[PDB]
Amino acid sequence: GNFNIFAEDDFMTQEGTLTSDPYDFANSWALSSGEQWCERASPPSSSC
Amino acid sequence: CSNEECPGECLVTGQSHFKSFDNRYFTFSGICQYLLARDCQDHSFSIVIETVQCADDRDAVCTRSVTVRLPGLHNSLVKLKHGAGVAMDGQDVQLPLLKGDLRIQHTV
Amino acid sequence: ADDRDAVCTRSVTVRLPGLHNSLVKLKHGAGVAMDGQDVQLPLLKGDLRIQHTV
Amino acid sequence: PKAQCPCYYDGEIFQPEDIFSDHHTMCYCEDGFMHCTM
Ligand SMILES: [Ca+2]
């Protein structure tokens, strides 16, 4: 996240918009590399 | 050799890579609706495009749809959509299509 | 069937004054023509729905 | 297809693992649904 004293506006996605879900936020920073190709990750569907 | 005019082409491919009618190449990458071509002398047609950003990235911009206006056919809007669909005046149609001077058809 | 008593039906025309003056033609194949123009199913309008079935 | 079939939207037909954001919304599509936001 950005580095300013405000700790609530620290979910800016790559496009510059602000979201609320952690996963879609963190999923906009994926980087591919040659052989490596990426599919977005979903929550683990496991409870206690 | 003898000079003689021959047909020109305006290609639009890739993320944002144009080719002017003569030969000029360039890249623009803007996100709005822009006027791609027009008769501009007798008002016989007009081609407009729509562009949006893809690939969740700063510099990736695509083109979604193309709108064609032909005053000859009364006043017709012929939308070409992201898929292979064609929509005239809001009604989806099944190809091929034939009219007084307009033809639309699938290719190989 | 080139016979005296063999008769069939080709097409059906339906007129709905509700949709202004809408003439819908159901043809020998599965095609549908509204006001002379072919359409691609499914179709949705005010209260009119046409679609392929299983 | 099981989850490899295309994504439908307002007239257009999209493809699995596609994204776009014009000026108002950010949209992708997993499985057969959009999950448009904003
Ligand atoms: Ca901060």
From Swiss-Prot, chain D:
Part of the whole protein covered: 703 to 740 of 2813
Record's protein name: von Willebrand antigen 2
